[model samples]
Target: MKKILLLNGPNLNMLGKREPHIYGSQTLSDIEQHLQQSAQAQGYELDYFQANGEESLINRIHQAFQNTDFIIINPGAFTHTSVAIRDALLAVSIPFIEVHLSNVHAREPFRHHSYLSDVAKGVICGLGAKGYDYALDFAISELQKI
Candidate 1:
């Protein structure tokens, strides 16, 4: 089975309760469960990690370098910040899809830019939790090409 690393960053743990208006009512666990079910049915081994700390998130990416075939990351606020996280992804040399629950481009001027997007295989946003599902499907398709 192909291996996947699913990484969620800061404030994402507060998914359902954080902002029902923008992020919707699905909890992080709910998203994970949905992805897990899809992964299992598709015969992919999925591993998950969520961290509020940038260092911890970077370390997890490092750890996944050797074992994972693909990555799906929602770097939360770190998308606009944290060059270290971007560096870690570069170091791993893995293909990744960046996801966002809300349309960052429609939100703020600061949210318009992402350091990771330039390096990402693809980006999915503004589709709520379903963005994750699309990302997983894209990753699975890309992995099959290798």
Candidate 2:
């Protein structure tokens, strides 16, 4: 089966309760459960990691190099600031989709840029938690094309 790594960063752990107005009502586990179910039915192996720290997130990206075939990442606040995480993804040479619950483009000026965007296979944003579902489906389809 194809293996996919789902990496979440920073405040994403607080999903459901964090900001219902933006992130919606689903918890992190809820999102994982949905993705897991879909992955199994589609014959993909899904591995997940969530870290509030930059170093931990980068380490997980490094670890994914050996076994992961595709990656779906929501780098949270690090999207605009972390060259280290971006470097780790580049080093792994893994194709990844960047996701955001809210439309960063519609929010702050600072949120308008992403360090990983230029390297990401694609990006899904402003669709709420469903953005993740869309990303997973896209990744699965792209992997099949390979």
Candidate 3:
């Protein structure tokens, strides 16, 4: 079976418990579980992980090298500031899509810039948890095309 890694960064673990106005009511686990069977139906193994530290996320990317066929990530606040996250994704050279529950572009100016968008296969935002479902679909379809 093919494999996909779901990499969530910094503070995303607090999803459902965070702000409902922006993040919605689904917890991180709810999102993962909802996607689990969908990935399985597509014949892909899904490894989901979340971290509050840059180093940990980079380490997970390193761990994904040769292990993960594709990646779907929501880099949280790191989307604007972390070169290491972008660097690690490049290091692994795995196809990845960037996701955001809230529309970064619709928010503050700082949220408008993403360090990963230039290199990611695609970017999804503003759709709440549904954005992840879209990212997963794109990743799986792209993998199929490959």
Candidate 4:
């Protein structure tokens, strides 16, 4: 019975309400419930977490160390600047995939580069909530191989 840690960062708490044109109309809870049911149908369970602060997000990853089988993260604004999150992931030595609701690379020059991308097992973006869904699908697929 392996587990996945679904991590979201910063203002993702505002998913459905915050710029629906960009993030889409589905709420975070909707995505969570959908993914959870999907995971369970495949005989997996997911742990979901979101943080507005860097340390808390990093700390959650810390706790996932050696316990969680895989990680699917959307680090919000930190995707461009959070080296510490990258370091935490490396420290845990856990395999992970990076996800973004909006396509950061197309938005701004600053959003184009990510501190976590190079280290990501796979990076997914520009597909709104479907990005996370794909990440989970890929995560489960890879887990099958392991």
Show model 4 residue runs off by greater than 4 Å. Answer: 19-21
Instruction: Assess the local accuracy of residue 43 in candidate 2 as a C-alpha lDDT between 0 and 100.
Output: 92
lDDT value, residue 132 of candidate 4: 84
Q: For each candidate, give its TM-score against the true structure.
A: 0.95, 0.95, 0.94, 0.94
Q: How many residue pairs clash in each candidate?
A: 0, 0, 0, 0
CA shift of 2, model 1, Å: 1.6
**Residue 17 displacement (Å), model 4:** 1.4
Clashing pairs in 2: none
Misplaced by over 4 Å in model 1 are 18-22
CA lDDT of each candidate? 0.91, 0.91, 0.89, 0.89
What's the true lDDT of residue 56 in model 1? 97
lDDT of 2 by residue, 80-105 (tens): 99999999999999999999988889
Segments in model 2 whose C-alpha atoms lie over 4 Å from true places? 19-21
Lowest lDDT 10-residue stretch of candidate 3: 17-26
lDDT of 4 by residue, 1-146 (tens): 89998999999989888663655687888988888889999999899998898899999999998889999999999988899999999999989999987778787799888899999899988888888888999999999998
The residue-by-residue lDDT of candidate 1 on 99-131, one tens digit each, is 998888998899998899999988988898889
TM-score computed on alpha carbons, candidate 3 = 0.94
State the local distance difference test value for candidate 3: 0.89
